[PDB]
Paper text:
Here, we have described a global mapping of structure–function relationships among the members of the tautomerase superfamily (TSF)4 (3, 4). From a structural perspective, the functionally diverse members of the TSF share a small, structurally similar core domain that comprises a β-α-β motif. All biochemically characterized enzymes in the superfamily fall into five reaction types, each of which uses the N-terminal proline either as a general base or a general acid. The domain structure of the TSF is relatively simple, with nearly all of the members represented by either a single β-α-β structural motif or as fusion proteins composed of two of these subdomains.
Starting from the short 4-OT, the transition to the Fused 4-OT reflects the fusion of the single β-α-β unit represented by the short 4-OTs to form proteins with two β-α-β subdomains that are roughly twice as long as the short 4-OTs. The percent identity for each pair of sequences along the similarity path is 42% between 4-OT and the Fused 4-OT, 41% between Fused 4-OT and Linker 2, 26% between Linker 2 and Linker 1, 31% between Linker 1 and CgX, and 33% between CgX and cis-CaaD. Among the characterized fusion proteins of the TSF, only two enzymes showed substantial 4-OT activity, Fused 4-OT and Linker 2. CHMI has been reported to have 4-OT activity as well. Fig. S6 indicates that the characterized Fused 4-OT protein matches best with 4-OT Level 2 subgroup 1. Indeed, both Fused 4-OT and Linker 2 were shown to be proficient tautomerases with 2-HM, whereas Linker 1, cis-CaaD, and CgX showed no activity. Compared with 4-OT, Linker 2 exhibited only a 2-fold drop in kcat/Km, whereas Fused 4-OT showed a 23-fold drop in kcat/Km. Linker 1 and Fused 4-OT do not show cis-CaaD activity. Especially interesting is that two of the key structural connections linking the 4-OT and cis-CaaD subgroups, Fused 4-OT and Linker 2, also exhibit multiple links to the MIF and MSAD subgroups as well as links between the cis-CaaD subgroup and the MIF and MSAD subgroups. We speculate that the central position of Fused 4-OT and Linker 2 in the structure similarity network offers a starting point for new studies aimed at addressing the evolution of the contemporary TSF subgroups from an ancient scaffold.
Author numbering:
A (entry chain B), B (entry chain C), C (entry chain A): 2 to 128
The structure:
Amino acid sequence: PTLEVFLPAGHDDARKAELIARLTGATVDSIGAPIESVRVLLTELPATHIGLGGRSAADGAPPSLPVIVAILIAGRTDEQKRALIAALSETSASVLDAPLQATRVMIKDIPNTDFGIGGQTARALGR
Amino acid sequence: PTLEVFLPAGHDDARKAELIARLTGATVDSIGAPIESVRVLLTELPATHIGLGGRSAADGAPPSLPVIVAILIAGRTDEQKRALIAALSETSASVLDAPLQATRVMIKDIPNTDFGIGGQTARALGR
Amino acid sequence: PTLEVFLPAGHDDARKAELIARLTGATVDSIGAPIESVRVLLTELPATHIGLGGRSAADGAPPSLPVIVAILIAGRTDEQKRALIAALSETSASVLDAPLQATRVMIKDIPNTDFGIGGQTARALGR
């Protein structure tokens, strides 16, 4: 699985490492992915680059991050996704001290014909 | 809705804020999302990170219009999507003094099982 | 590296597998990433979702795909990035039978503090 996490700029290395550790744990627990297959990509945004309701965070918008994109090989059930969504949301909210209501998760379900690892498709690899 | 706007570096904070405000308004008009639900994420990239036709601006490609990825919960109609592409594109061209002809919008539908709002799935809510 | 390729829906599995293999080789050649580290996700788009000039592909827009978002651990040189943009663009255009001028590449650099592999940061792992 590959997570892209949009978060406010400013957090220190220890907090970011903790975010990575905890979101990875949340993923492993939720959808049973091998821990070494979980990739986390943190994308920091300045307040001037974050908008909610047409207002920038620099101009006082309420919190709107983290937004997490979770890229998964197709196959997880609806209720497994529901569990993933709950776990990533509560974990990222806790670590970053963000309101849970502000979190958003978007799963991108990728057909096994449409996903490549090492140049080989997930379908080729039996996934 | 969440818009990720891939933006070449160089615009000042006022133009970024104007873009956030006007893209948000275009989204509200075209697909009728509650304004408070519209998120804009500006992904500002150096010219060396942006390829057009196989080259960066630094290697001779013409300047880049924004590329907007519009992430929607599944369920918007074809007419709404048509209106969204037009509105976001006209707004981009107007705000950035740029050719309408080169504006880009890519819509990604997320199934309601795959979308998370405050830790709950869209489907589990009324969506 | 993590590549997301926006492409028209409807390509057959053989062509998608070829695209994944060839984009992977292009990435290894260009920036020297270990082949097993290269992940590719294809994001298929309906023609009504693909906007250029404020009109969708289904509504008569000129070719505008493939668009590739390449997320890299930071540290690649401008020359490496130039090579990557060229190779990804030429390869994806060739495989998908698309015009080179339609292609776009967007590179996101992730600091090694912001990149996770198996719950550990790239910096932790000596990357």
